[PDB]
Amino acid sequence: LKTQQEQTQSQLAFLQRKFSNQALYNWLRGRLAAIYFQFYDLAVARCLM
Amino acid sequence: LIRKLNTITSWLHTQKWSVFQLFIMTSTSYNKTLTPEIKNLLDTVYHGLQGFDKDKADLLHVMAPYIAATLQLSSENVAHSVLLWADKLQPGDGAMTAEKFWDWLNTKYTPGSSEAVETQEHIVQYCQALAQLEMVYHSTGINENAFRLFVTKPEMFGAATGAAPAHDALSLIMLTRFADWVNALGEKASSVLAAFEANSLTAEQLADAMNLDANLLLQASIQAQNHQHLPPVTPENAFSCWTSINTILQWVNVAQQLNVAPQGVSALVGLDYIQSMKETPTYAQWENAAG
Amino acid sequence: FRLFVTKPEMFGAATGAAPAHDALSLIMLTRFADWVNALGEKASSVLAAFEANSLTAEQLADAMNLDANLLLQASIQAQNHQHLPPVTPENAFSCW
Amino acid sequence: EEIDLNSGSTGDWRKTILKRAFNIDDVSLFRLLKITDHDNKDGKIKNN
Amino acid sequence: AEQAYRWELNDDSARFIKPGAWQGTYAGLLAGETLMLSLAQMEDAHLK
Amino acid sequence: IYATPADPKALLSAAVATSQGGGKLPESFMSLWRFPHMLENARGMVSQLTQFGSTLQNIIERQDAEALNALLQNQAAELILTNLSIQDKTIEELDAE
Amino acid sequence: IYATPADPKALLSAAVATSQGGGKLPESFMSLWRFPHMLENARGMVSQLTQFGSTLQNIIERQDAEALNALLQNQAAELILTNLSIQDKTIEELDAE
């Protein structure tokens, strides 16, 4: 069981420093959402033209 | 003080948080240091807001998703709420605003350079402060819109009305108990909180929410109004103010505990020894209460 | 890890020598890592402060949940007695 | 004997007798009365 | 494209592509999409 | 008389929604371009918009998935604690035996 | 006096971030091409860049997954060892009984 704890914590540590983070997707979605709003306004401007 | 320590200790033990976990949230220390995480926020808000016009849109609103990108798992509405709270609290050795903040970003900041203006320290604080408030939303687990109501109008949660929303152990546990109350309402919760936004929320409606008899709630509000409280309870604010709701609810819990109507609770509290120094209660009155 | 390879000086190396690749050094690195994870969440703030000479007692105090005065008195006590690597106010919290 | 079974009322010992007899508070007793008679506009019982 | 734009109108002070879409942390992902916003903006100013 | 702990309670979770609405339509512009050319131009732009759409959506769903993963590792790492304390009490029992 | 091992401590993991920033914009060039032709050329280039983007992203996420997978297999293969020994001790127990 002690080993198992060190197992799980180890996996958890992975979740921390694996390249695909919680943070990575947070910034990724944040930025892409901002750019998506701005780009919607520009494309609806086109459609209105 | 003893009452306060007892209450908060019992509450932390109840909810499995050490004192330290609470300190990092309640307190206004804010260690100033340039962490990689903060550097990343500053970068995302810098390149994000490169072109901003005070006229076209609100600063906070344009800014919201950008800081939400840096903090772990927070939505946009969450981020905005955090910013309103930030600007209300002014967290720094130098009082901070999203405006002062943005001023410093656009003015004196340069990405990927270690050296920077010492003013950064005040600003660094601001950042960790945002993260702090973020935790409060997640930690207490309040409804997102509700959290926004809290920061926008802390007044309805019994605040001074002239003050920034409270960042206290007392107010944090309030937030928790409110969240838990909403969850107790369950499916009806949206209807309830919505009604609480306007003066729409009434007894008989909260009654339909908590599966209690409407008359129980109505009698409870009456009885709360009749007796004097530290925050008084009046027909106008019985269900607009959370504090009045918590009070009236407490009347319900006591009454349901003694298996009696609020009517009985009034007689019981009437039997107070110092209060009845003025009109001494009948023996027969005591018999009535006993019955 | 990058800090260790770039400035082995800050981990007690000769300062004119290549960062150490010895069993003793390996255990140094390990006890360092375990110490960092003990810092846990504040670790970024800690390491950031360790980058400059910014890292101080009273602040590591907020990091390790210990009393500030405990660490400050600890520093005093370390500085007075003679150690193999001596400790002076200037290098007490900058050198690991 | 008129017995006040109004939700928001403290009444004669008779109300109390009804309550011990049924193990009910004033409130649920009032609902009970409403199920007894829907035309009883005021909280009165004939006691019969 | 920015330069040829700064040519077609006499305005040479036009700044439509700003650093930096690419980011050091992260793979540098979203660099491209961010750029195509800058381009889309440029086309908007040009057409108006 | 023998006290009976009674009927462990169920837990409730809140289902609440966001409401956001927009004006929102911006003032149109008159293009020196003929109809088919602007039609296909707005077409190109809109295709790029939908593309940002599917990429954004994917990003959100994957964000939520990493969240769920993190939640799992944390709560499991918590359960192993009490299980550990349990093991120690059962070996304590073996010593009593 | 009966010795009590007291509690089992929980383990902690450090969450640390990388920070890198760029200047960075390189000096512009004056192209002998007219505005729309360069607009659409640079457009083409940007779609090719983004395409590389999503492809690269996929590569990383799949890399991370194969890694997590490897860890899982390694550590399970390590638990089965102690389990095998546990079994050796239970057959030993049956021989004692």
Compute the distance between CA of residue B28 and CA of residue A47 in angstroms, rounded to an integer. 51
Compute the distance between CA of residue G69 and CA of residue A49 in angstroms, rounded to an integer. 52
Cβ neighbour number for residue F36 with a 10 Å cutoff: 8
- Give the contacts of F59 (CB within 8 A, at least 6 positions apart): A25, A28, A29, A32
Compute the distance between CA of residue B153 and CA of residue B137 in angstroms, rounded to an integer. 15
With an 8 Å Cβ cutoff, the interface of chain B facing chain A consists of 40, 44, 48, 65-66, 68-74, 76
Q: Is E27 on the interface with F (CB under 8 A)?
A: no
CB E6 within 8 A of CB E46: no
* 3-state secondary structure string across C4-29: HHHCHHHHCCCCCCCCCCCHHHHHHH
Cβ-defined contact of G18 to B35 (cutoff 8 Å): no
Q: Side chain identity at G42, as an amino acid letter?
A: A
Chain E interface mutation, best of A24, A27, A35, highest count of E Cβ atoms under 10 Å: A35
Q: Which residues of C touch G9 (CB under 8 A)?
A: none
Residue in the structure block whose two tokens are 């077609």: E8
**DSSP-assigned letter for residue F9:** P
CB G18 within 8 A of CB C44: no
Cβ-defined contact of E32 to G18 (cutoff 8 Å): no
Q: Taking the alpha carbons of C27, C28, C29, C31 in that order, is the dihedral positive or negative?
A: positive
Cβ neighbour number for residue B216 with a 10 Å cutoff: 25
Are E and G neighbours with ≥3 CB pairs closer than 8 A?
A: yes
Q: Which residues of C touch B31 (CB under 8 A)?
A: 45, 59, 62
Question: Which of A24, A31, A42 is nearest residue E44 as measured by Cβ atoms?
Answer: A42
Cβ-defined contact of F48 to E48 (cutoff 8 Å): no
Compute the distance between CA of residue B89 and CA of residue B168 in angstroms, rounded to an integer. 12
Q: Side chain identity at B182, as an amino acid letter?
A: V
User: Which of D40, D5, D3 shows the shortest CA–CA distance to B263?
Assistant: D5
Cβ-defined contact of E40 to F31 (cutoff 8 Å): no
Q: Which contacts qualify for G40-48: CB closer than 8 Å, 24 or more apart?
A: G41/E1, G42/E1, G42/E39, G43/E36, G43/E39, G46/E32, G46/E35, G46/E36, G46/E39, G47/E32, G47/E36
Q: Which residues of G touch C47 (CB under 8 A)?
A: 16
- Give the contacts of B30 (CB within 8 A, at least 6 positions apart): B91, B92, B125, B128, B129, B132
Compute the distance between CA of residue F83 and CA of residue B140 in angstroms, rounded to an integer. 27
The burial class, CB within 10 Å (0-12 / 13-18 / 19+), for G1 is exposed
Compute the distance between CA of residue B291 and CA of residue F1 in angstroms, rounded to an integer. 26
Q: Tokens for A24?
A: 């990575």
Question: Which helix H or strand E contains D4, and what residues bound it?
Answer: strand D3-4
Are E and F neighbours with ≥3 CB pairs closer than 8 A?
A: yes
Compute the distance between CA of residue B258 and CA of residue G37 in angstroms, rounded to an integer. 84
Helix (H) and strand (E) counts in chain C: 5, 0
The 3-state DSSP class for residue D45 equals: strand
Q: Taking the alpha carbons of B76, B80, B81, B82 in that order, is the dihedral positive or negative?
A: positive
Are G and D neighbours with ≥3 CB pairs closer than 8 A?
A: no
Q: Is F83 on the interface with A (CB under 8 A)?
A: yes
Q: State the helix-helix crossing angle for B76-89 and B120-140, rounded to 10 degrees.
A: 120
Residue D44: beta bridge partners? D4
Are D and F neighbours with ≥3 CB pairs closer than 8 A?
A: no
- Measured at the alpha carbon of residue F61, what is the angle toward residues B48 and G51, in degrees to the nearest 5? 65
Compute the distance between CA of residue C89 and CA of residue G38 in angstroms, rounded to an integer. 62
Query: How many angstroms separate the CA of residue E45 from the nearest CA in chain A?
Result: 10
Cβ neighbour number for residue C45 with a 10 Å cutoff: 26
Chain G interface mutation, best of C2, C32, C35, C36, highest count of G Cβ atoms under 10 Å: C36
CB E32 within 8 A of CB G46: yes
Q: Before E20, cis peptide (omega within 30)?
A: yes
Residue D3: beta bridge partners? D45
CB E37 within 8 A of CB A35: yes
Q: Is B35 on the interface with G (CB under 8 A)?
A: yes
**DSSP-assigned letter for residue F10:** P
Chains B, D: CB pairs < 8 Å: 38
Query: How many angstroms separate the CA of residue A12 from the nearest CA in chain B?
Result: 16
Q: How many CA within 13 A on the CB side of residue B120? A: 17
User: Which of B70, B266, G31 shows the shortest CA–CA distance to E3?
Assistant: G31
CA distances from B120 to B41, B128, C63 (A): 13, 12, 21
Compute the distance between CA of residue C3 and CA of residue B272 in angstroms, rounded to an integer. 70
CB B111 within 8 A of CB E18: no
Compute the distance between CA of residue D15 and CA of residue D9 in angstroms, rounded to an integer. 10
Q: How many CA within 13 A on the CB side of residue B158? A: 17
Residue D45: beta bridge partners? D3
Rounded to 10 degrees, the C-alpha dihedral F50/F51/F54/F57 comes to -90
Cβ neighbour number for residue F39 with a 10 Å cutoff: 14
* 3-state secondary structure string across chain B: CHHHHHHHHHHHHHHCCCHHHHHHHHCCCCCCCCCHHHHHHHHHHHHHCCCCCCCCCCHHHHHHHHHHHHCCCCCHHHHHHHHHHHHHHCCCCCCCCHHHHHHHHHHHCCCCCCCCCCCHHHHHHHHHHHHHHHHHHHHHCCCHHHHHHHHHCHHHHCCCCCCCCCCCHHHHHHHHHHHHHHHHHHHHHHHHHHHHHCCCCCCCCHHHHHCCCHHHHHHHHHHHHHCCCCCCCCCCCCCCCHHHHHHHHHHHHHHHHCCCCHHHHHHHHHCCCCHHHCCCCCHHHHHHHHC
Q: How many CA within 13 A on the CB side of residue F74? A: 7
Q: Which residues of F touch E40 (CB under 8 A)?
A: 45, 48
Rounded to 10 degrees, the C-alpha dihedral F67/F69/F70/F74 comes to 140
Tell me how long chain G is.
97
The burial class, CB within 10 Å (0-12 / 13-18 / 19+), for F20 is exposed
User: Which of B116, E12, G64, B147 shows the shortest CA–CA distance to A24?
Assistant: G64
User: Which of B278, G47, A41, B58 shows the shortest CA–CA distance to F23?
Assistant: A41
Question: Which helix H or strand E contains C63, and what residues bound it?
Answer: helix C60-64
User: Which of B144, B170, B169, B171 shows the shortest CA–CA distance to B156?
Assistant: B171
Chain G interface mutation, best of C1, C30, C44, highest count of G Cβ atoms under 10 Å: C44
Compute the distance between CA of residue A24 and CA of residue A22 in angstroms, rounded to an integer. 6
User: Which of F11, D25, D5 shows the shortest CA–CA distance to B254?
Assistant: D25
CA distances from G7 to B9, F82, F83, F88 (A): 21, 9, 11, 9
Q: Side chain identity at A10, as an amino acid letter?
A: S
Q: Which residues of E touch G39 (CB under 8 A)?
A: 1, 4, 39, 42-43, 46
CB B214 within 8 A of CB B207: yes
In chain B, positions 65-84, which contact chain F (CB-CB < 8 Å)? 73, 77
Query: How many angstroms separate the CA of residue B17 from the nearest CA in chain G?
Result: 14
Cβ-defined contact of C48 to B31 (cutoff 8 Å): no
- Measured at the alpha carbon of residue B105, what is the angle toward residues B102 and B108, in degrees to the nearest 5? 135
CB F36 within 8 A of CB F43: no
With an 8 Å Cβ cutoff, the interface of chain A facing chain E consists of 24, 27-28, 31-32, 35, 38-39, 42-43, 45, 49
Q: Is A36 on the interface with F (CB under 8 A)?
A: yes
Cβ-defined contact of E26 to A28 (cutoff 8 Å): yes
User: Which of B231, B226, B79, B209 shows the shortest CA–CA distance to B155?
Assistant: B231
Residue in the structure block whose two tokens are 């983070």: A21
Compute the distance between CA of residue E11 and CA of residue F56 in angstroms, rounded to an integer. 35
Question: Which helix H or strand E contains D44, and what residues bound it?
Answer: strand D44-45
Compute the distance between CA of residue B248 and CA of residue B238 in angstroms, rounded to an integer. 8
Q: Is C3 on the interface with G (CB under 8 A)?
A: no
User: Which of A37, A36, E47 shows the shortest CA–CA distance to F42?
Assistant: E47
- Phi and psi torsions of D3, nearest 5°: -120, 125
Rg (CA), chain G: 30
Cβ-defined contact of A35 to E47 (cutoff 8 Å): no
CB B150 within 8 A of CB B175: yes
Q: Is C30 on the interface with G (CB under 8 A)?
A: no
Residue in the structure block whose two tokens are 């390996």: C26
The burial class, CB within 10 Å (0-12 / 13-18 / 19+), for C6 is exposed
In chain B, positions 109-148, which contact chain F (CB-CB < 8 Å)? 143-146
- Give the contacts of B206 (CB within 8 A, at least 6 positions apart): B192, B217, B239, B245
User: Which of B32, B59, B28, B48 shows the shortest CA–CA distance to B117?
Assistant: B32
CB B173 within 8 A of CB B206: no
Q: Is F51 on the interface with A (CB under 8 A)?
A: no
Q: Tokens for A37?
A: 């709003």
Q: Tokens for E10?
A: 């006499």
User: Which of B83, B143, A33 shows the shortest CA–CA distance to F19?
Assistant: B143
- Residue E47 CA to its chain's centroid (Å): 15
Antiparallel, parallel or unpaired: β D44-45 and D3-4: antiparallel
CB D23 within 8 A of CB D13: no
- Measured at the alpha carbon of residue A19, what is the angle toward residues A17 and A22, in degrees to the nearest 5? 75
- Phi and psi torsions of D45, nearest 5°: -125, 130
Cβ-defined contact of B73 to F67 (cutoff 8 Å): yes
Q: Is G20 on the interface with E (CB under 8 A)?
A: yes
Q: Is F76 on the interface with A (CB under 8 A)?
A: yes
**DSSP-assigned letter for residue C58:** T
**DSSP-assigned letter for residue G27:** P
The 3-state DSSP class for residue D25 equals: coil
Q: Side chain identity at A44, as an amino acid letter?
A: V
Question: Which of A5, A16, A20 is nearest residue G11 as measured by Cβ atoms?
Answer: A5
**DSSP-assigned letter for residue F49:** H
Q: Taking the alpha carbons of C93, B20, B171, B178 in that order, is the dihedral positive or negative?
A: positive
Tell me how long chain B is.
291
The burial class, CB within 10 Å (0-12 / 13-18 / 19+), for B94 is middle
Chains that contact A by 3+ CB pairs under 8 Å?
B, E, F, G
Query: How many angstroms separate the CA of residue G19 from the nearest CA in chain B?
Result: 5
User: Which of D8, D5, D40 shows the shortest CA–CA distance to D19?
Assistant: D5
CA distances from F8 to B179, F1, F4, F5 (A): 22, 21, 12, 8
Residue D4: beta bridge partners? D44
Rg (CA), chain A: 20
Compute the distance between CA of residue B44 and CA of residue G19 in angstroms, rounded to an integer. 11
Q: Is A38 on the interface with F (CB under 8 A)?
A: no
In our burial notation (b when 16+ CB lie closer than 10 A, e otherwise), range B110-146 reads ebeeeebeebbbbbbbbbbbbbbbbebbebbebbbbb
CB B252 within 8 A of CB D40: no
The 3-state DSSP class for residue F43 equals: helix
CA distances from B254 to A22, B227, B228, B265, F6 (A): 45, 15, 17, 8, 21
| Elucidation technique | X-ray
Chain E residue closest in CA terms to F32? E47
- Phi and psi torsions of D44, nearest 5°: -120, 140
CB B263 within 8 A of CB D10: yes
Q: Before G24, cis peptide (omega within 30)?
A: yes
